[PDB]
PDB file of N, CA and C in Angstrom:
ATOM      1  N   UNK A   1     -52.308  58.129 -40.189  1.00 51.22           N
ATOM      2  CA  UNK A   1     -52.702  57.135 -39.186  1.00 51.22           C
ATOM      3  C   UNK A   1     -51.903  57.267 -37.894  1.00 51.22           C
ATOM      4  N   UNK A   2     -52.313  58.200 -37.043  1.00 49.62           N
ATOM      5  CA  UNK A   2     -51.636  58.428 -35.771  1.00 49.62           C
ATOM      6  C   UNK A   2     -52.488  57.935 -34.605  1.00 49.62           C
ATOM      7  N   UNK A   3     -53.037  56.734 -34.747  1.00 51.01           N
ATOM      8  CA  UNK A   3     -53.872  56.148 -33.704  1.00 51.01           C
ATOM      9  C   UNK A   3     -53.036  55.299 -32.753  1.00 51.01           C
ATOM     10  N   UNK A   4     -51.900  54.813 -33.243  1.00 52.13           N
ATOM     11  CA  UNK A   4     -51.013  53.981 -32.438  1.00 52.13           C
ATOM     12  C   UNK A   4     -49.635  54.623 -32.310  1.00 52.13           C
ATOM     13  N   UNK A   5     -49.440  55.382 -31.238  1.00 52.67           N
ATOM     14  CA  UNK A   5     -48.167  56.052 -30.996  1.00 52.67           C
ATOM     15  C   UNK A   5     -47.451  55.444 -29.794  1.00 52.67           C
ATOM     16  N   UNK A   6     -46.114  55.547 -29.787  1.00 53.68           N
ATOM     17  CA  UNK A   6     -45.284  55.015 -28.702  1.00 53.68           C
ATOM     18  C   UNK A   6     -45.449  55.804 -27.407  1.00 53.68           C
ATOM     19  N   UNK A   7     -44.820  55.319 -26.342  1.00 54.28           N
ATOM     20  CA  UNK A   7     -44.897  55.980 -25.044  1.00 54.28           C
ATOM     21  C   UNK A   7     -44.137  57.303 -25.061  1.00 54.28           C
ATOM     22  N   UNK A   8     -44.654  58.286 -24.331  1.00 56.84           N
ATOM     23  CA  UNK A   8     -44.013  59.586 -24.276  1.00 56.84           C
ATOM     24  C   UNK A   8     -43.847  60.211 -25.647  1.00 56.84           C
ATOM     25  N   UNK A   9     -44.643  59.747 -26.606  1.00 57.15           N
ATOM     26  CA  UNK A   9     -44.582  60.265 -27.967  1.00 57.15           C
ATOM     27  C   UNK A   9     -45.097  61.699 -28.033  1.00 57.15           C
ATOM     28  N   UNK A  10     -44.487  62.500 -28.902  1.00 56.25           N
ATOM     29  CA  UNK A  10     -44.884  63.894 -29.062  1.00 56.25           C
ATOM     30  C   UNK A  10     -45.697  64.083 -30.340  1.00 56.25           C
ATOM     31  N   UNK A  11     -46.995  64.319 -30.178  1.00 56.50           N
ATOM     32  CA  UNK A  11     -47.882  64.514 -31.319  1.00 56.50           C
ATOM     33  C   UNK A  11     -47.322  65.567 -32.270  1.00 56.50           C
ATOM     34  N   UNK A  12     -46.950  66.718 -31.718  1.00 56.09           N
ATOM     35  CA  UNK A  12     -46.399  67.805 -32.520  1.00 56.09           C
ATOM     36  C   UNK A  12     -45.229  67.318 -33.367  1.00 56.09           C
ATOM     37  N   UNK A  13     -44.329  66.563 -32.746  1.00 59.82           N
ATOM     38  CA  UNK A  13     -43.164  66.032 -33.443  1.00 59.82           C
ATOM     39  C   UNK A  13     -43.566  64.964 -34.452  1.00 59.82           C
ATOM     40  N   UNK A  14     -44.611  64.212 -34.126  1.00 62.02           N
ATOM     41  CA  UNK A  14     -45.098  63.154 -35.003  1.00 62.02           C
ATOM     42  C   UNK A  14     -45.673  63.738 -36.290  1.00 62.02           C
ATOM     43  N   UNK A  15     -46.647  64.630 -36.145  1.00 60.43           N
ATOM     44  CA  UNK A  15     -47.282  65.264 -37.294  1.00 60.43           C
ATOM     45  C   UNK A  15     -46.296  66.167 -38.031  1.00 60.43           C
ATOM     46  N   UNK A  16     -45.171  66.456 -37.388  1.00 59.72           N
ATOM     47  CA  UNK A  16     -44.148  67.307 -37.983  1.00 59.72           C
ATOM     48  C   UNK A  16     -43.163  66.482 -38.805  1.00 59.72           C
ATOM     49  N   UNK A  17     -43.002  65.219 -38.430  1.00 59.90           N
ATOM     50  CA  UNK A  17     -42.090  64.322 -39.133  1.00 59.90           C
ATOM     51  C   UNK A  17     -42.687  63.869 -40.460  1.00 59.90           C
ATOM     52  N   UNK A  18     -41.817  63.423 -41.380  1.00 57.76           N
ATOM     53  CA  UNK A  18     -42.237  62.950 -42.704  1.00 57.76           C
ATOM     54  C   UNK A  18     -42.992  61.627 -42.634  1.00 57.76           C
ATOM     55  N   UNK A  19     -43.668  61.279 -43.723  1.00 60.95           N
ATOM     56  CA  UNK A  19     -44.431  60.037 -43.786  1.00 60.95           C
ATOM     57  C   UNK A  19     -43.528  58.828 -43.566  1.00 60.95           C
ATOM     58  N   UNK A  20     -42.267  58.959 -43.959  1.00 59.64           N
ATOM     59  CA  UNK A  20     -41.300  57.877 -43.803  1.00 59.64           C
ATOM     60  C   UNK A  20     -41.107  57.528 -42.331  1.00 59.64           C
ATOM     61  N   UNK A  21     -41.011  58.555 -41.493  1.00 57.13           N
ATOM     62  CA  UNK A  21     -40.824  58.356 -40.061  1.00 57.13           C
ATOM     63  C   UNK A  21     -42.139  57.992 -39.380  1.00 57.13           C
ATOM     64  N   UNK A  22     -43.243  58.479 -39.938  1.00 55.59           N
ATOM     65  CA  UNK A  22     -44.564  58.203 -39.385  1.00 55.59           C
ATOM     66  C   UNK A  22     -44.942  56.738 -39.585  1.00 55.59           C
ATOM     67  N   UNK A  23     -44.377  56.122 -40.618  1.00 51.49           N
ATOM     68  CA  UNK A  23     -44.656  54.722 -40.918  1.00 51.49           C
ATOM     69  C   UNK A  23     -43.693  53.803 -40.172  1.00 51.49           C
ATOM     70  N   UNK A  24     -42.515  54.327 -39.850  1.00 52.51           N
ATOM     71  CA  UNK A  24     -41.504  53.553 -39.139  1.00 52.51           C
ATOM     72  C   UNK A  24     -41.902  53.348 -37.680  1.00 52.51           C
ATOM     73  N   UNK A  25     -42.459  54.391 -37.073  1.00 52.13           N
ATOM     74  CA  UNK A  25     -42.885  54.325 -35.681  1.00 52.13           C
ATOM     75  C   UNK A  25     -44.212  53.588 -35.545  1.00 52.13           C
ATOM     76  N   UNK A  26     -45.047  53.691 -36.574  1.00 50.45           N
ATOM     77  CA  UNK A  26     -46.349  53.033 -36.572  1.00 50.45           C
ATOM     78  C   UNK A  26     -46.194  51.520 -36.699  1.00 50.45           C
ATOM     79  N   UNK A  27     -45.174  51.094 -37.437  1.00 49.41           N
ATOM     80  CA  UNK A  27     -44.917  49.674 -37.639  1.00 49.41           C
ATOM     81  C   UNK A  27     -44.533  48.999 -36.324  1.00 49.41           C
ATOM     82  N   UNK A  28     -44.072  49.801 -35.367  1.00 49.67           N
ATOM     83  CA  UNK A  28     -43.678  49.266 -34.076  1.00 49.67           C
ATOM     84  C   UNK A  28     -42.237  48.796 -34.061  1.00 49.67           C
ATOM     85  N   UNK A  29     -41.426  49.349 -34.957  1.00 48.70           N
ATOM     86  CA  UNK A  29     -40.017  48.982 -35.043  1.00 48.70           C
ATOM     87  C   UNK A  29     -39.125  50.143 -34.613  1.00 48.70           C
ATOM     88  N   UNK A  30     -37.814  49.935 -34.691  1.00 48.48           N
ATOM     89  CA  UNK A  30     -36.854  50.964 -34.306  1.00 48.48           C
ATOM     90  C   UNK A  30     -37.128  51.462 -32.891  1.00 48.48           C
ATOM     91  N   UNK A  31     -36.857  50.610 -31.908  1.00 49.79           N
ATOM     92  CA  UNK A  31     -37.075  50.961 -30.511  1.00 49.79           C
ATOM     93  C   UNK A  31     -35.861  50.594 -29.662  1.00 49.79           C
ATOM     94  N   UNK A  32     -35.002  51.575 -29.411  1.00 50.97           N
ATOM     95  CA  UNK A  32     -33.801  51.352 -28.614  1.00 50.97           C
ATOM     96  C   UNK A  32     -33.901  52.068 -27.270  1.00 50.97           C
ATOM     97  N   UNK A  33     -34.359  53.315 -27.301  1.00 49.96           N
ATOM     98  CA  UNK A  33     -34.504  54.109 -26.087  1.00 49.96           C
ATOM     99  C   UNK A  33     -35.340  53.367 -25.049  1.00 49.96           C
ATOM    100  N   UNK A  34     -36.590  53.082 -25.396  1.00 50.45           N
ATOM    101  CA  UNK A  34     -37.491  52.374 -24.494  1.00 50.45           C
ATOM    102  C   UNK A  34     -37.896  51.024 -25.077  1.00 50.45           C
ATOM    103  N   UNK A  35     -38.624  50.239 -24.288  1.00 53.01           N
ATOM    104  CA  UNK A  35     -39.074  48.924 -24.725  1.00 53.01           C
ATOM    105  C   UNK A  35     -40.523  48.973 -25.198  1.00 53.01           C
ATOM    106  N   UNK A  36     -40.771  48.431 -26.387  1.00 52.44           N
ATOM    107  CA  UNK A  36     -42.116  48.424 -26.932  1.00 52.44           C
ATOM    108  C   UNK A  36     -43.132  47.846 -25.966  1.00 52.44           C
ATOM    109  N   UNK A  37     -44.380  48.284 -26.090  1.00 54.12           N
ATOM    110  CA  UNK A  37     -45.448  47.806 -25.221  1.00 54.12           C
ATOM    111  C   UNK A  37     -46.337  46.806 -25.953  1.00 54.12           C
ATOM    112  N   UNK A  38     -45.834  45.589 -26.127  1.00 52.99           N
ATOM    113  CA  UNK A  38     -46.583  44.540 -26.810  1.00 52.99           C
ATOM    114  C   UNK A  38     -47.553  43.854 -25.854  1.00 52.99           C
TER     115      UNK A  38
ATOM    116  N   UNK B   1     -23.199  78.088 -35.100  1.00 55.51           N
ATOM    117  CA  UNK B   1     -24.648  78.150 -34.954  1.00 55.51           C
ATOM    118  C   UNK B   1     -25.165  76.955 -34.159  1.00 55.51           C
ATOM    119  N   UNK B   2     -26.096  77.214 -33.246  1.00 57.67           N
ATOM    120  CA  UNK B   2     -26.670  76.159 -32.419  1.00 57.67           C
ATOM    121  C   UNK B   2     -28.004  75.687 -32.988  1.00 57.67           C
ATOM    122  N   UNK B   3     -28.182  74.373 -33.055  1.00 57.71           N
ATOM    123  CA  UNK B   3     -29.412  73.794 -33.578  1.00 57.71           C
ATOM    124  C   UNK B   3     -30.139  72.986 -32.507  1.00 57.71           C
ATOM    125  N   UNK B   4     -31.463  72.947 -32.601  1.00 58.46           N
ATOM    126  CA  UNK B   4     -32.277  72.210 -31.641  1.00 58.46           C
ATOM    127  C   UNK B   4     -32.799  70.914 -32.252  1.00 58.46           C
ATOM    128  N   UNK B   5     -32.508  69.796 -31.593  1.00 60.04           N
ATOM    129  CA  UNK B   5     -32.948  68.491 -32.070  1.00 60.04           C
ATOM    130  C   UNK B   5     -34.091  67.951 -31.217  1.00 60.04           C
ATOM    131  N   UNK B   6     -35.293  67.942 -31.786  1.00 59.90           N
ATOM    132  CA  UNK B   6     -36.470  67.451 -31.081  1.00 59.90           C
ATOM    133  C   UNK B   6     -36.760  65.999 -31.452  1.00 59.90           C
ATOM    134  N   UNK B   7     -36.560  65.099 -30.496  1.00 62.37           N
ATOM    135  CA  UNK B   7     -36.800  63.679 -30.722  1.00 62.37           C
ATOM    136  C   UNK B   7     -38.294  63.374 -30.771  1.00 62.37           C
ATOM    137  N   UNK B   8     -38.628  62.134 -31.108  1.00 64.38           N
ATOM    138  CA  UNK B   8     -40.023  61.714 -31.192  1.00 64.38           C
ATOM    139  C   UNK B   8     -40.734  61.919 -29.857  1.00 64.38           C
ATOM    140  N   UNK B   9     -39.959  61.945 -28.777  1.00 65.37           N
ATOM    141  CA  UNK B   9     -40.513  62.136 -27.444  1.00 65.37           C
ATOM    142  C   UNK B   9     -40.568  63.614 -27.076  1.00 65.37           C
ATOM    143  N   UNK B  10     -40.363  64.474 -28.070  1.00 65.98           N
ATOM    144  CA  UNK B  10     -40.393  65.905 -27.830  1.00 65.98           C
ATOM    145  C   UNK B  10     -39.219  66.380 -26.999  1.00 65.98           C
ATOM    146  N   UNK B  11     -38.082  65.709 -27.147  1.00 66.61           N
ATOM    147  CA  UNK B  11     -36.880  66.067 -26.403  1.00 66.61           C
ATOM    148  C   UNK B  11     -35.960  66.945 -27.246  1.00 66.61           C
ATOM    149  N   UNK B  12     -35.877  68.223 -26.889  1.00 65.86           N
ATOM    150  CA  UNK B  12     -35.033  69.166 -27.610  1.00 65.86           C
ATOM    151  C   UNK B  12     -33.584  69.075 -27.146  1.00 65.86           C
ATOM    152  N   UNK B  13     -32.664  69.026 -28.103  1.00 66.26           N
ATOM    153  CA  UNK B  13     -31.243  68.939 -27.792  1.00 66.26           C
ATOM    154  C   UNK B  13     -30.448  69.995 -28.552  1.00 66.26           C
ATOM    155  N   UNK B  14     -29.848  70.922 -27.812  1.00 72.31           N
ATOM    156  CA  UNK B  14     -29.057  71.987 -28.414  1.00 72.31           C
ATOM    157  C   UNK B  14     -27.650  71.504 -28.751  1.00 72.31           C
ATOM    158  N   UNK B  15     -27.260  71.668 -30.011  1.00 69.89           N
ATOM    159  CA  UNK B  15     -25.937  71.249 -30.462  1.00 69.89           C
ATOM    160  C   UNK B  15     -25.219  72.390 -31.176  1.00 69.89           C
ATOM    161  N   UNK B  16     -23.950  72.588 -30.833  1.00 71.34           N
ATOM    162  CA  UNK B  16     -23.152  73.646 -31.442  1.00 71.34           C
ATOM    163  C   UNK B  16     -22.436  73.137 -32.689  1.00 71.34           C
ATOM    164  N   UNK B  17     -22.962  73.495 -33.855  1.00 70.48           N
ATOM    165  CA  UNK B  17     -22.373  73.075 -35.121  1.00 70.48           C
ATOM    166  C   UNK B  17     -22.208  74.257 -36.070  1.00 70.48           C
ATOM    167  N   UNK B  18     -21.679  73.985 -37.259  1.00 70.18           N
ATOM    168  CA  UNK B  18     -21.468  75.028 -38.257  1.00 70.18           C
ATOM    169  C   UNK B  18     -21.979  74.584 -39.624  1.00 70.18           C
ATOM    170  N   UNK B  19     -22.216  75.561 -40.513  1.00 70.75           N
ATOM    171  CA  UNK B  19     -22.709  75.295 -41.868  1.00 70.75           C
ATOM    172  C   UNK B  19     -21.662  74.616 -42.744  1.00 70.75           C
ATOM    173  N   UNK B  20     -20.427  74.567 -42.252  1.00 72.79           N
ATOM    174  CA  UNK B  20     -19.334  73.948 -42.991  1.00 72.79           C
ATOM    175  C   UNK B  20     -19.090  72.521 -42.509  1.00 72.79           C
ATOM    176  N   UNK B  21     -19.472  72.252 -41.265  1.00 76.09           N
ATOM    177  CA  UNK B  21     -19.296  70.926 -40.682  1.00 76.09           C
ATOM    178  C   UNK B  21     -20.129  69.889 -41.429  1.00 76.09           C
ATOM    179  N   UNK B  22     -19.967  68.625 -41.054  1.00 77.51           N
ATOM    180  CA  UNK B  22     -20.702  67.537 -41.688  1.00 77.51           C
ATOM    181  C   UNK B  22     -21.725  66.934 -40.733  1.00 77.51           C
ATOM    182  N   UNK B  23     -22.751  66.304 -41.294  1.00 77.53           N
ATOM    183  CA  UNK B  23     -23.797  65.681 -40.490  1.00 77.53           C
ATOM    184  C   UNK B  23     -23.201  64.753 -39.436  1.00 77.53           C
ATOM    185  N   UNK B  24     -22.099  64.097 -39.789  1.00 74.02           N
ATOM    186  CA  UNK B  24     -21.431  63.179 -38.874  1.00 74.02           C
ATOM    187  C   UNK B  24     -21.079  63.879 -37.564  1.00 74.02           C
ATOM    188  N   UNK B  25     -20.723  65.155 -37.659  1.00 72.37           N
ATOM    189  CA  UNK B  25     -20.360  65.936 -36.483  1.00 72.37           C
ATOM    190  C   UNK B  25     -21.591  66.245 -35.634  1.00 72.37           C
ATOM    191  N   UNK B  26     -22.698  66.555 -36.300  1.00 69.54           N
ATOM    192  CA  UNK B  26     -23.943  66.868 -35.607  1.00 69.54           C
ATOM    193  C   UNK B  26     -24.479  65.652 -34.862  1.00 69.54           C
ATOM    194  N   UNK B  27     -24.416  64.492 -35.510  1.00 68.46           N
ATOM    195  CA  UNK B  27     -24.892  63.253 -34.908  1.00 68.46           C
ATOM    196  C   UNK B  27     -24.072  62.896 -33.674  1.00 68.46           C
ATOM    197  N   UNK B  28     -22.757  63.062 -33.774  1.00 68.59           N
ATOM    198  CA  UNK B  28     -21.861  62.760 -32.665  1.00 68.59           C
ATOM    199  C   UNK B  28     -22.271  63.521 -31.407  1.00 68.59           C
ATOM    200  N   UNK B  29     -22.620  64.791 -31.579  1.00 69.70           N
ATOM    201  CA  UNK B  29     -23.032  65.628 -30.458  1.00 69.70           C
ATOM    202  C   UNK B  29     -24.209  65.005 -29.717  1.00 69.70           C
ATOM    203  N   UNK B  30     -25.238  64.622 -30.467  1.00 68.17           N
ATOM    204  CA  UNK B  30     -26.424  64.009 -29.879  1.00 68.17           C
ATOM    205  C   UNK B  30     -26.052  62.812 -29.012  1.00 68.17           C
ATOM    206  N   UNK B  31     -24.975  62.129 -29.384  1.00 67.34           N
ATOM    207  CA  UNK B  31     -24.512  60.965 -28.639  1.00 67.34           C
ATOM    208  C   UNK B  31     -24.090  61.354 -27.227  1.00 67.34           C
ATOM    209  N   UNK B  32     -23.328  62.436 -27.121  1.00 66.20           N
ATOM    210  CA  UNK B  32     -22.857  62.915 -25.826  1.00 66.20           C
ATOM    211  C   UNK B  32     -23.973  63.636 -25.074  1.00 66.20           C
ATOM    212  N   UNK B  33     -25.117  63.792 -25.732  1.00 70.30           N
ATOM    213  CA  UNK B  33     -26.261  64.463 -25.128  1.00 70.30           C
ATOM    214  C   UNK B  33     -27.264  63.447 -24.587  1.00 70.30           C
ATOM    215  N   UNK B  34     -27.728  62.559 -25.460  1.00 73.81           N
ATOM    216  CA  UNK B  34     -28.691  61.536 -25.068  1.00 73.81           C
ATOM    217  C   UNK B  34     -27.998  60.196 -24.838  1.00 73.81           C
ATOM    218  N   UNK B  35     -27.159  59.799 -25.790  1.00 74.89           N
ATOM    219  CA  UNK B  35     -26.447  58.541 -25.676  1.00 74.89           C
ATOM    220  C   UNK B  35     -26.885  57.528 -26.715  1.00 74.89           C
ATOM    221  N   UNK B  36     -27.266  58.017 -27.890  1.00 74.85           N
ATOM    222  CA  UNK B  36     -27.710  57.146 -28.972  1.00 74.85           C
ATOM    223  C   UNK B  36     -26.637  57.014 -30.046  1.00 74.85           C
ATOM    224  N   UNK B  37     -26.330  55.765 -30.428  1.00 75.11           N
ATOM    225  CA  UNK B  37     -25.322  55.475 -31.451  1.00 75.11           C
ATOM    226  C   UNK B  37     -25.774  55.892 -32.846  1.00 75.11           C
ATOM    227  N   UNK B  38     -24.816  55.970 -33.780  1.00 71.68           N
ATOM    228  CA  UNK B  38     -25.093  56.356 -35.168  1.00 71.68           C
ATOM    229  C   UNK B  38     -25.878  55.290 -35.921  1.00 71.68           C
ATOM    230  N   UNK B  39     -26.047  54.131 -35.291  1.00 70.67           N
ATOM    231  CA  UNK B  39     -26.781  53.029 -35.903  1.00 70.67           C
ATOM    232  C   UNK B  39     -28.281  53.173 -35.659  1.00 70.67           C
ATOM    233  N   UNK B  40     -28.636  53.779 -34.531  1.00 70.61           N
ATOM    234  CA  UNK B  40     -30.037  53.979 -34.180  1.00 70.61           C
ATOM    235  C   UNK B  40     -30.400  55.458 -34.206  1.00 70.61           C
ATOM    236  N   UNK B  41     -29.415  56.299 -34.503  1.00 69.93           N
ATOM    237  CA  UNK B  41     -29.631  57.740 -34.560  1.00 69.93           C
ATOM    238  C   UNK B  41     -29.982  58.182 -35.977  1.00 69.93           C
ATOM    239  N   UNK B  42     -31.072  58.931 -36.106  1.00 70.02           N
ATOM    240  CA  UNK B  42     -31.516  59.418 -37.405  1.00 70.02           C
ATOM    241  C   UNK B  42     -31.877  60.898 -37.339  1.00 70.02           C
ATOM    242  N   UNK B  43     -31.527  61.636 -38.387  1.00 67.45           N
ATOM    243  CA  UNK B  43     -31.813  63.064 -38.449  1.00 67.45           C
ATOM    244  C   UNK B  43     -32.916  63.357 -39.460  1.00 67.45           C
ATOM    245  N   UNK B  44     -33.667  64.425 -39.217  1.00 66.69           N
ATOM    246  CA  UNK B  44     -34.753  64.815 -40.107  1.00 66.69           C
ATOM    247  C   UNK B  44     -34.774  66.324 -40.321  1.00 66.69           C
ATOM    248  N   UNK B  45     -34.584  66.743 -41.566  1.00 63.56           N
ATOM    249  CA  UNK B  45     -34.582  68.162 -41.905  1.00 63.56           C
ATOM    250  C   UNK B  45     -35.119  68.385 -43.317  1.00 63.56           C
ATOM    251  N   UNK B  46     -35.856  69.478 -43.496  1.00 68.17           N
ATOM    252  CA  UNK B  46     -36.426  69.808 -44.796  1.00 68.17           C
ATOM    253  C   UNK B  46     -37.470  68.779 -45.214  1.00 68.17           C
ATOM    254  N   UNK B  47     -37.897  67.953 -44.262  1.00 67.61           N
ATOM    255  CA  UNK B  47     -38.889  66.935 -44.552  1.00 67.61           C
ATOM    256  C   UNK B  47     -38.266  65.631 -45.012  1.00 67.61           C
ATOM    257  N   UNK B  48     -36.939  65.578 -45.005  1.00 67.34           N
ATOM    258  CA  UNK B  48     -36.220  64.381 -45.425  1.00 67.34           C
ATOM    259  C   UNK B  48     -35.080  64.066 -44.461  1.00 67.34           C
ATOM    260  N   UNK B  49     -34.642  62.812 -44.459  1.00 64.10           N
ATOM    261  CA  UNK B  49     -33.557  62.383 -43.585  1.00 64.10           C
ATOM    262  C   UNK B  49     -32.204  62.797 -44.152  1.00 64.10           C
ATOM    263  N   UNK B  50     -31.272  63.129 -43.266  1.00 66.49           N
ATOM    264  CA  UNK B  50     -29.936  63.544 -43.679  1.00 66.49           C
ATOM    265  C   UNK B  50     -28.964  62.370 -43.639  1.00 66.49           C
ATOM    266  N   UNK B  51     -27.826  62.527 -44.308  1.00 65.47           N
ATOM    267  CA  UNK B  51     -26.813  61.479 -44.347  1.00 65.47           C
ATOM    268  C   UNK B  51     -25.496  61.973 -43.754  1.00 65.47           C
ATOM    269  N   UNK B  52     -24.668  61.036 -43.304  1.00 65.82           N
ATOM    270  CA  UNK B  52     -23.378  61.375 -42.716  1.00 65.82           C
ATOM    271  C   UNK B  52     -22.364  61.736 -43.797  1.00 65.82           C
ATOM    272  N   UNK B  53     -22.701  61.421 -45.044  1.00 65.39           N
ATOM    273  CA  UNK B  53     -21.809  61.719 -46.150  1.00 65.39           C
ATOM    274  C   UNK B  53     -22.161  63.021 -46.844  1.00 65.39           C
ATOM    275  N   UNK B  54     -22.537  64.024 -46.059  1.00 64.35           N
ATOM    276  CA  UNK B  54     -22.903  65.326 -46.607  1.00 64.35           C
ATOM    277  C   UNK B  54     -22.640  66.435 -45.592  1.00 64.35           C
ATOM    278  N   UNK B  55     -22.733  67.681 -46.048  1.00 64.59           N
ATOM    279  CA  UNK B  55     -22.504  68.830 -45.181  1.00 64.59           C
ATOM    280  C   UNK B  55     -23.821  69.470 -44.757  1.00 64.59           C
ATOM    281  N   UNK B  56     -23.811  70.118 -43.597  1.00 65.30           N
ATOM    282  CA  UNK B  56     -25.006  70.776 -43.077  1.00 65.30           C
ATOM    283  C   UNK B  56     -25.549  71.789 -44.079  1.00 65.30           C
ATOM    284  N   UNK B  57     -24.656  72.606 -44.628  1.00 66.02           N
ATOM    285  CA  UNK B  57     -25.045  73.622 -45.599  1.00 66.02           C
ATOM    286  C   UNK B  57     -25.718  72.985 -46.812  1.00 66.02           C
ATOM    287  N   UNK B  58     -25.399  71.719 -47.060  1.00 66.17           N
ATOM    288  CA  UNK B  58     -25.973  70.993 -48.187  1.00 66.17           C
ATOM    289  C   UNK B  58     -27.482  70.840 -48.024  1.00 66.17           C
ATOM    290  N   UNK B  59     -27.928  70.732 -46.777  1.00 61.51           N
ATOM    291  CA  UNK B  59     -29.348  70.577 -46.484  1.00 61.51           C
ATOM    292  C   UNK B  59     -29.974  71.912 -46.094  1.00 61.51           C
ATOM    293  N   UNK B  60     -29.233  72.993 -46.317  1.00 60.37           N
ATOM    294  CA  UNK B  60     -29.714  74.330 -45.988  1.00 60.37           C
ATOM    295  C   UNK B  60     -29.921  74.481 -44.485  1.00 60.37           C
ATOM    296  N   UNK B  61     -29.103  73.779 -43.707  1.00 64.33           N
ATOM    297  CA  UNK B  61     -29.195  73.836 -42.253  1.00 64.33           C
ATOM    298  C   UNK B  61     -28.764  75.201 -41.728  1.00 64.33           C
ATOM    299  N   UNK B  62     -29.738  76.076 -41.504  1.00 62.14           N
ATOM    300  CA  UNK B  62     -29.459  77.416 -41.000  1.00 62.14           C
ATOM    301  C   UNK B  62     -29.343  77.413 -39.479  1.00 62.14           C
ATOM    302  N   UNK B  63     -29.107  78.587 -38.906  1.00 62.12           N
ATOM    303  CA  UNK B  63     -28.976  78.721 -37.460  1.00 62.12           C
ATOM    304  C   UNK B  63     -30.289  78.386 -36.760  1.00 62.12           C
ATOM    305  N   UNK B  64     -30.190  77.880 -35.535  1.00 60.81           N
ATOM    306  CA  UNK B  64     -31.371  77.519 -34.760  1.00 60.81           C
ATOM    307  C   UNK B  64     -32.261  76.558 -35.542  1.00 60.81           C
ATOM    308  N   UNK B  65     -31.650  75.795 -36.443  1.00 59.60           N
ATOM    309  CA  UNK B  65     -32.386  74.837 -37.259  1.00 59.60           C
ATOM    310  C   UNK B  65     -33.155  73.853 -36.382  1.00 59.60           C
ATOM    311  N   UNK B  66     -34.414  73.612 -36.738  1.00 61.82           N
ATOM    312  CA  UNK B  66     -35.259  72.695 -35.984  1.00 61.82           C
ATOM    313  C   UNK B  66     -35.092  71.262 -36.480  1.00 61.82           C
ATOM    314  N   UNK B  67     -34.104  70.563 -35.935  1.00 64.21           N
ATOM    315  CA  UNK B  67     -33.839  69.181 -36.322  1.00 64.21           C
ATOM    316  C   UNK B  67     -34.723  68.218 -35.536  1.00 64.21           C
ATOM    317  N   UNK B  68     -34.911  67.019 -36.079  1.00 59.63           N
ATOM    318  CA  UNK B  68     -35.731  66.004 -35.426  1.00 59.63           C
ATOM    319  C   UNK B  68     -34.997  64.668 -35.368  1.00 59.63           C
ATOM    320  N   UNK B  69     -34.737  64.194 -34.156  1.00 59.76           N
ATOM    321  CA  UNK B  69     -34.041  62.926 -33.963  1.00 59.76           C
ATOM    322  C   UNK B  69     -35.024  61.759 -33.962  1.00 59.76           C
ATOM    323  N   UNK B  70     -34.734  60.747 -34.774  1.00 62.45           N
ATOM    324  CA  UNK B  70     -35.589  59.571 -34.865  1.00 62.45           C
ATOM    325  C   UNK B  70     -34.791  58.291 -34.639  1.00 62.45           C
ATOM    326  N   UNK B  71     -35.443  57.288 -34.062  1.00 61.46           N
ATOM    327  CA  UNK B  71     -34.794  56.010 -33.789  1.00 61.46           C
ATOM    328  C   UNK B  71     -34.761  55.140 -35.042  1.00 61.46           C
ATOM    329  N   UNK B  72     -33.573  54.659 -35.390  1.00 61.56           N
ATOM    330  CA  UNK B  72     -33.406  53.812 -36.566  1.00 61.56           C
ATOM    331  C   UNK B  72     -33.678  52.350 -36.227  1.00 61.56           C
ATOM    332  N   UNK B  73     -33.802  51.521 -37.257  1.00 61.70           N
ATOM    333  CA  UNK B  73     -34.063  50.099 -37.069  1.00 61.70           C
ATOM    334  C   UNK B  73     -33.099  49.499 -36.050  1.00 61.70           C
ATOM    335  N   UNK B  74     -33.651  48.902 -35.000  1.00 62.33           N
ATOM    336  CA  UNK B  74     -32.841  48.287 -33.956  1.00 62.33           C
ATOM    337  C   UNK B  74     -33.229  46.825 -33.753  1.00 62.33           C
ATOM    338  N   UNK B  75     -32.286  46.031 -33.256  1.00 61.89           N
ATOM    339  CA  UNK B  75     -32.549  44.622 -33.025  1.00 61.89           C
ATOM    340  C   UNK B  75     -33.808  44.393 -32.211  1.00 61.89           C
ATOM    341  N   UNK B  76     -33.858  44.987 -31.023  1.00 64.55           N
ATOM    342  CA  UNK B  76     -35.017  44.829 -30.164  1.00 64.55           C
ATOM    343  C   UNK B  76     -35.895  46.065 -30.145  1.00 64.55           C
TER     344      UNK B  76
END
């Protein structure tokens, strides 16, 4: 489920990361670098 | 050996580490590179996340290893 990705997100890096990280970013959590777009 | 850390934003970061060093050393480097603390800094190798209580060689971290930096749970 890569329909909702963060800003400046890298598809290659996303599909390359494990399901654990793919679910962490999809949940909309763990955002320190930039501010979420709610 | 130098390793490349590609963040979720496709940001590659070259770090000079060794197969004998510990993950803690690799993470520290990224800090002086991007500026992310060990609380929000996460590593990804072999399809799994690494820990600070282990050695690079433990995860089979070879030269020019393609590491992936991920943001950990943060307050905001």
